[PDB]
Design a protein around this ligand. Structure first.
Ligand SMILES: O=c1oc(CC2CCCCC2)cc2cc(O)cc(O)c12
Ligand SMILES: O=c1oc(CC2CCCCC2)cc2cc(O)cc(O)c12
Ligand SMILES: N[C@@H](CCCC[NH3+])C(=O)O
Ligand SMILES: N[C@@H](CCCC[NH3+])C(=O)O
Lengths: 506, 504
């Protein structure tokens, strides 16, 4: 009932051990077997069967404490996501090492123990370890919370270790996360790609439309910006001869935080020379279908779109995925024609009127790109929840780094894959013409002058790199944390990140 | 003059746009790559022509030559390999353009799309005979020769040029990526689990270094970039992931030199129920197997004093030498460093030792910095022919280290060095939270003296240890420095694609 008193008493316990000779935190306890390999090595065992001649050294954490008297103690030893029962029988205690009750009465829930025992099964058939001596390795000073104590509380985020020990779903989630990353890294290596590392601190943060962070190097007396994307240096590497290049790493964006936006998130960007929008479309379908089948043995997975209480929807990752032109669908749903130039006063004022007629939120500044973005968000992003789908051919005012469309004026050969109305992939034929790239950078500078602090700045080093010849390439970016959210059935981005960015407790 | 040539090529591209032809085509289907092409038709004799195999090749023209007007020769480079391209007026498809007008516009550095057939020249050089050549992406500037990248900083700013010209840089970065690949697989075979800890934190802990500062606007919160991945990984050990690790970037706001880049790649791994000895064995096994995985031997040739001097033989054959820091300093300096090491007497003693030897006194002459300087000038270069370990560091220097089980005042720590450069840091993790807060408060006392790189107390980490940190052994690897020695490089900038530098 009193956690503060419990902690103070356990602290006194540790000090009392030090005063009365014993060391509560020993340096080494040479383990012989792990709990998973122990379960695997002795599960196929008969009821009540004992192996009193095979002594083993096993470690673990106590999570359940109970006793059937002063001579029979019961515990639950967990380790590596698995668990076994500890059946301490006084008939088996090595009395040369110490008193039975004196040794086991000190054990508390959460204590990390080292056990010298023998394997067997109980009368009821519970696979257990029968110790001959139990030594405390690392005591737990606080009271462990209950599962309900972590249900709708932020302790899962601020104290992830508690969430990893109490909830099995947490360990499962992060194991699946690393499996997603392993699958992607191998999927790219098997195709001949080359993993690299581009700087996170830069003189100019380009590659996306977002406000970056700023830091300062004292010895150089230089202001560096945290990378918002890895697009630019990767294309610079494509120029360098590495025709198959990619990077898996953290990117930072200083903007709002919600269930889908963490200030720092893991992204994967790959550049494939002599490839185009079609190649990226096929790549996306192939990769997602195989990733989902690799993790579940099926193409249809269930996802609780409306939270855990409401019923879930079914997402079918079976290719091919629907392709939806942004401009044309907005036209059909709104029964209007967005005459070009899309950034003209007429088209901008028109889109403003359609945003006002539907009482949709007006973006500030009302740049043409933000108007089109809000229109696509409120009218075509949630068009399909049954399966993932592609929003393609974005206008040039929205894609300053995109190569212009070969048969559609004003549009680009860009694609964006969405899952449950959430952007998870951004791919497109790279704009390799420096003459036309500088025009988009200058137009972005004007947009920046209108209050659009997300408008891409002018990177001179990247432009000069394009001047030596960027072969026709195709690039794609993946939001790994979001992919994990959908593939692990989690509604928040804080549930797929070990230590998410939280409001400080001060 | 390069300016005139860039302007001529620029006007050239504009003339192509006004003339009707698209200078940067959208798509060119490649049927075979340069490596596959060398592999597929290398065995052809000098003079054979498979005129029926119409292939689509791609690459960057790196040499332009001619024999009259009917013969044009170029070097097509791609994926680190080079082939010949022999354009003849007999095989040219005249329906798509004039031969001379089509090939006179190709210069060195142009990305072209060739449609031809494989064959071998009269001299025997594997070649692609094109029937049509299309300019896919033009090179507007003058690509320099290899000599143009020797006495300059261009290799670091325009890494693409160094990768396209110096064929050794490509090998160096391929080796770097292979080193990381080997490390990741090496850990995964032992059951380790890869994770991702935050790079922005309320406190920058895990090492003795000055961090960078940044600010999140919506939260109006100042955050420090991580200087190490130690504390969050240990908290994960407490969470039940007994074999965890992370290979990522860490940021330290310090000075720049040949072995220091503000941002560098490190690998920290925490293995529960392990200790100082297990880490020693792990380091020896890993370095020996990595070296033999790359070179087929345990001996490496490294130009320790630059390529202008004879190199040395680094033998990674286990087992390496182990040296106690305090013991060696007392032997080499013929002095007695008494405990407490941070006492005024021994602090003045180390200061006088540095003074009589004419060494630079650390910025704040603290006991930890003093010991570090003594080790750097009297121990760290004891072995160059083989990597070696500096062990049993004092607790004053290791606030996150578990005290030595038998040597008072020391810790069960180890640092491996190669040619005097620290490349590994491992030690038995301190799991007693009370001793931890004691060491952290001591670090604060040393911060009061003006130590910007003294660890600040992380309340979250201390609270994490209170729930029970099992005996664990932790280690950290400096990937960039390891790559430097395995690629025979004297500067860290030579192993980082884009090192931190001043603006142009
Ligand atoms: O996860 C994220 O994904 C994306 C969009 C993502 C689409 C696919 C290509 C990479 C980017 C943006 C974003 C912005 C934030 O400020 C925080 C975030 O976590 C994200
Ligand atoms: O490479 C580096 O290695 C180390 C030391 C290294 C030892 C092994 C464990 C990881 C750290 C420190 C350092 C500091 C810098 O400011 C810049 C750098 O590049 C480095
Ligand atoms: N960097 C892009 C995604 C990859 C684009 C690839 N050409 C982004 O921030 O969305
Ligand atoms: N964080 C350490 C490496 C890991 C030491 C073992 N926990 C360093 O920066 O040197």
């Amino acid at each position: 009932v009193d956690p503060r008193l419990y902690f103070e008493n356990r602290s006194k316990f540790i000090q009392d051990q030090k005063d009365k000779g014993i060391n509560p935190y020993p340096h080494k306890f040479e383990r012989t077997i792990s709990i998973p390999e122990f379960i695997e090595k002795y599960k196929d065992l008969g009821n009540g069967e004992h192996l009193e001649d095979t002594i083993l050294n096993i470690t673990g954490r106590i999570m359940r404490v109970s006793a059937s008297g002063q001579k029979l103690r019961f515990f639950d030893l967990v380790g590596d996501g698995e668990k076994i029962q500890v059946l301490a029988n006084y008939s088996f205690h090595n009395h040369e090492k110490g008193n039975f009750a004196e040794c086991y009465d000190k054990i508390r829930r959460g204590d990390i123990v080292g056990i010298v025992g023998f394997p067997g099964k109980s009368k009821k058939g519970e696979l257990s370890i029968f110790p001959k001596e139990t030594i405390l390795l690392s005591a737990c000073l606080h009271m462990l919370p209950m599962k309900y104590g972590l249900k709708d509380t932020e302790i899962r985020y601020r104290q992830r270790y508690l969430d990893l020990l109490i909830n099995e779903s947490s360990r499962h989630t992060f194991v699946t996360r690393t499996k997603i990353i392993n699958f992607l890294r191998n999927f790219l290596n098997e195709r001949g790609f080359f993993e690299v590392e581009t700087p996170m601190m830069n003189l100019i943060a380009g590659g996306a439309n977002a406000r970056p962070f700023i830091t300062h190097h004292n010895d150089l007396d230089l202001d560096l910006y945290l990378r918002i994307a890895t697009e630019l240096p990767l294309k610079m590497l494509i120029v360098g001869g590495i025709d198959k290049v990619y990077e898996i790493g953290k990117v930072f964006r200083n903007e709002g935080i919600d269930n889908t936006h963490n200030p720092e998130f893991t992204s994967c960007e790959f550049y494939w020379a002599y490839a185009d929008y079609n190649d990226l479309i096929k790549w996306s379908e192939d990769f997602f279908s195989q990733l989902v089948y690799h993790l579940f043995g099926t193409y249809k997975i269930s996802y609780n779109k409306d939270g855990p209480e409401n019923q879930p929807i079914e997402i079918d990752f079976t290719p091919p995925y629907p392709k939806v032109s942004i401009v044309e669908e907005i036209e059909k749903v709104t029964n209007t024609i967005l005459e070009q130039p899309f950034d003209s006063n007429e088209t901008i004022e028109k889109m403003i009127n359609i945003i006002k007629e539907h009482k949709i939120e007006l973006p500030n500044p009302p740049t043409a790109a933000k108007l089109l973005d809000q229109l696509a968000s409120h009218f075509i992003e949630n068009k399909y929840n049954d399966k993932p789908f592609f929003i393609v051919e974005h206008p040039q005012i929205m894609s300053p780094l995109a190569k212009y469309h070969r048969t559609k004026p004003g549009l680009t050969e860009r694609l964006e894959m969405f899952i449950c109305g959430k952007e998870v992939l951004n791919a497109y034929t790279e704009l390799n013409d420096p003459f036309k790239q500088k025009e988009c950078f200058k137009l972005q500078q004007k947009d920046r002058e209108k209050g659009d602090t997300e408008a891409a700045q002018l990177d001179s080093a990247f432009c000069t790199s394009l001047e030596y010849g960027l072969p026709p390439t195709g690039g794609l970016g993946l939001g790994i944390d979001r992919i994990t959210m959908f593939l692990t059935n989690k509604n928040s981005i804080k549930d797929v990140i070990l230590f998410p960015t939280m409001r400080p407790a001060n």
